[PDB]
Each structure stands twice: as structure tokens, then as C-alpha cells.
Amino acid sequence: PLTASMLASAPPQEQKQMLGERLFPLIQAMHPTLAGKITGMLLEIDNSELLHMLESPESLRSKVDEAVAVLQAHQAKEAAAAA
């Protein structure tokens, strides 16, 4: 289990790496092809929010739904621009 205190002694890029290694396998179980992209999108948010999502499966699942909708929106935006 990854805690605020384990993150606190690491430099910020290492903190994002440690959160990433815990989130990636959960996100990969949901969306194997998008797991790298969705993990990257979630790592941009506040570390406190990321620790909450590792403790609350319902919060993580909703945030992954937000990431999937955001990717769909971006694909639609690009299709609108090309048409």
C-alpha cells in the first residue's frame, strides 16, 4: 500500500513514477490498450487526488470514465477539423 508518507521523501518526478506503477495495473485491467495513455492523463492531477483513487475503486473507475470521454472528445474534435 502506497501512502502520502512514502511519497513525501521522493522528488516530484519519482512521486509521479511511484503513483503510476500502482495505478497502471488497475487501469490496464479496465482498458488494456489505453492504460498507458489514461495513466499519463491521471498523473497530471494533484498527488492527493491520486492517493484517494488508489484507496477508492469507485473514484478511480469514474476518473477513468472521464479520461475515456476526454479521449473520445479529442478524436471527435480532430474529425470535425478534418471534415
Binding site: 495513466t39 499519463g40 492523463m41 498523473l43 476526454v70
Partner: peptide, 12 residues
Amino acid sequence: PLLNPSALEFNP
């Protein structure tokens, strides 16, 4: 606002 669709991929 919403998540960033241009975020860099995480590679584990």
C-alpha cells in the same frame, strides 16, 4: 477543468 487529452503516456 477536464483531463488533458494531450498528456504524455506513462510507461511502467
